């Protein structure tokens, strides 16, 4: 049972993962703004390697992953529901359907109002 | 034995269908509903210089597409259409292009990238990406359009060297030269495949 | 200053190179065959197979002749062995030249006109042209036997070829001229097609140009002396010509062409060398 | 989803030892006529 | 509602943990290991112009069917290698093909969202059209009923004579990739792209149990010969065995050298051997009880897309993207 639980709502959003080998997948941070669709914020690989950010938050947000603790952190310093999403398969450098209306490997999300 | 006769007839028909199958080039058309894909499963068959092109637009499934995309492993090219006019969804198009480019089962397929609706972009420029301020136009032919093209080309050239190539084009809604461009990039793709075979790459 | 060693080393090097090329070509043919028609791979496979078989047969016959203390008299009463050896020599000389010209033409078409090459050639045509080239080489080899004359023993008394060291009728001169003209035509066609391909690529490109240049240089250098000598002998009546001292050298150079074919065609690629 | 979870939780389960024992019994009884 | 669902899931997990007293590996520790299985390629079926996507053995154990990327559906005689039939498809994006137990019909489907049913007596006889996603799998119950799964996260039971969905099965949150019929033909199992598998009652039409052990999408599902267990292959490079009566996973078949997904699974006649096709171009044969790799089937130049074991267990057919079907014994 793959489970992703988001906490937090400057902020220190956390995502606790279970039901899969955390240090085998590429993690993403996504949001859904009111009256809009799911938008990709950030992306981190499986070994702290190359990190990507979206234009709207470039340079302002940061992402990290604790493989030993199996957690995903997003430090921020707009109002939306934030989700931590997982790549569908391990050892692949591409998350395909993370920003989909019904994605199986995405958490429940946490609200952030600014 | 009549079974051998039936098998031989089937094999002859299969050879004929092999000729027909190899004499055709198949293309996968991708892009968001925002872009003008149609103006560029729906099947479009056209001919350039007595060469047959069959383009497929798959729009009958859900937005989860990591499983039925693998059906297009041996497609000749992926025509990716992007609305350069809308800056709001430009990052979505960039992420879509990156996912298509870096897919394991699409890592040997070349992409013809169309930057559609260049008239709307030109109108909008005359009276999202903070790196645009620290950008200078290249020594190419005849700034925003080339900035977007370079944004796509950075992803294209980041990975997949020598296996597949990206062919950017600037397009309008009333452009009539897209078929010729597709023909030329397909010719270059075939040449690259031949060169990779001759060198045992 | 003649010994069976020359033949033995040439045999071993050619066989080993062609076997390595055959294995690499089989693997590459499977891999590239589940992508398109591998016409170049099929032609290269035919070329290396022909080179291996010619090396084996001709070297075996030469070693048998050498081991018999050059006693050409009391082992071939009807000169059947000499005719067979001459047929094998002519086939193993002609087949690589025609095959190389065919691959040059195919690669020129596939580079200058890739869409036409992919859509209107197919693999049945490639197999048919390979078989036709082999059959044409066989027919040209057999033609003197299918006529009236027979292959003679050369001045070195170690190989059988056309009648050269004799002022014969017009038949011997015609046969020598035919062999020389076919070889030179193959060389010229290969040169022209490879030059066109290299010019098109210049105006994976660098490696392709390098291998084309190597193919041209090796083929020309290693096959021109023998064809020129044969043409000179055929045009004249050996009254104004060379002797066995240079004919053997030219034959050795042709042997080295057949040896170096797999290396300049298959084995010198970056992926293969890895 | 709640009703389906209740329906799935409202069933009886056989111990894992019994399931493994039956799997072993079937495999050992039918291995005589397994060509592979 | 989320709290209640979480509590119910926790209760189910606690019940499963209480039920599990021993392990399958511990139970199967005193039995003799299966020797090194060395199956050789007895046949090679050629004729498909592109990648082979699916195959299905006939119940007569001699004739089989295969679907290809070039929109071809070829029925082969496995013994004599001769081709029995070649059917052209309207759509060349097929994903599955099925053989009727009677041998008179063959079904297929794909990206067209249609299940096409052809009478071998060869032209189409039925076109079932109720799915809003690509048709991933289809299995015949008899000449009149067929069970299908699609990418719209639902399964269906169709009456072929009327061409209408007799029953629908809902509950999967991802695209359903495979299904397997029980030997009794009263239950079936389905695996989907949500790392979960479900057991469905055909007659009632309701989900019985849900099994969640895998980490990624499940591509293959197969049913144990006696019908009290099933095996699943997924994208996390592992295969798993689940027992219906215990309602929990029993054994995991994986090694720390496989980093590719599983595209197909199958069982031998006795169920002792589990055969799984991988994306690394090779097939692996595992000891089902001891979870040890009993052997390897190699000889395909591309990834193995489909895999099946004959009804009498006398051969294994594997189809790959290398456009070839290989029979192994
Ligand atoms: C016009 C024919 C060109 C030959 C090309 C070929 C057959 O592919 C290479 C051949 C060598 C063969 C030469 C036969 C006799 C040689 C004379 C004896 C002498 O030199 O004293 C053996 O010698 C070992 C082969 O390497």
Residue numbers in the entry:
A (entry chain N): 1 to 9, 17 to 84, 90 to 126
B (entry chain A): 17 to 56, 207 to 253, 264 to 303, 311 to 325, 336 to 394
C (entry chain R): 27 to 229, 243 to 313
D (entry chain G): 15 to 50
E (entry chain B): 7 to 127, 133 to 340
Paper text:
Carboprost, an analog of prostaglandin F2α and an agonist for the prostaglandin F2-alpha receptor (FP receptor), is clinically used to treat postpartum hemorrhage (PPH). However, off-target activation of closely related receptors such as the prostaglandin E receptor subtype EP3 (EP3 receptor) by carboprost results in side effects and limits the clinical application. The FP-miniGs/q70iN-Gβ1γ2-Nb35 complexes bound to carboprost or latanoprost-FA were purified and their structures were solved using cryo-EM with resolutions of 2.7 Å and 3.2 Å, respectively. Y922.65, T184ECL2 and R2917.40 form hydrogen bonds or salt bridges with 1-carboxyl of the α-chain, while M1153.32, F18745.51, F2055.41, W2626.48, F2656.51 and L2907.39 form hydrophobic interactions with the ω-chain (superscripts denote Ballesteros-Weinstein numbering). Additionally, Q2977.46 form hydrogen bonds with 15-hydroxyl. S331.39, T2947.43 and H812.54 form a sub-pocket to accommodate the 9-hydroxyl and 11-hydroxyl of the F-ring through hydrophilic interactions. Thus, we use the carboprost-bound active state structure for the following structure analysis because the structure has a slightly higher resolution. The smaller outward shift of TM6 on the FP receptor results in a narrow G-protein binding pocket, which leads to a different orientation of the α5 helix in the FP-miniGs/q70iN complex compared to the EP2-Gαs complex and EP3-Gαi complex.
Prostaglandins, the metabolic products of arachidonates, regulate various physiologic functions through interacting and activating nine different prostaglandin receptors that belong to the G protein coupled receptor family. The endogenous prostaglandins include Prostaglandin F2α (PGF2α), Prostaglandin E2 (PGE2), Prostaglandin D2 (PGD2), Prostaglandin I2 (PGI2), and thromboxane A2 (TXA2), while the corresponding receptors include prostaglandin F2α (FP) receptor, Prostaglandin E2 (EP1-4) receptors, Prostaglandin D2 (DP1-2) receptors, Prostaglandin I2 (IP) receptor and Thromboxane A2 (TP) receptor. These receptors further activate different subtypes of G protein, with DP1, EP2, EP4, and IP receptors primarily couple to Gs; FP, EP1 and TP receptors primarily couple to Gq and EP3 receptor couples to Gi1. Among them, the FP receptor is highly expressed in smooth muscle, uterine myometrium and eye9–11, which makes it a target for the treatment of glaucoma and postpartum hemorrhage (PPH), the severe bleeding after childbirth. Activation of the FP receptor in the human myometrium by its endogenous agonist prostaglandin F2α (PGF2α) causes the elevation of intracellular calcium concentration and leads to contraction of the uterine smooth muscle.
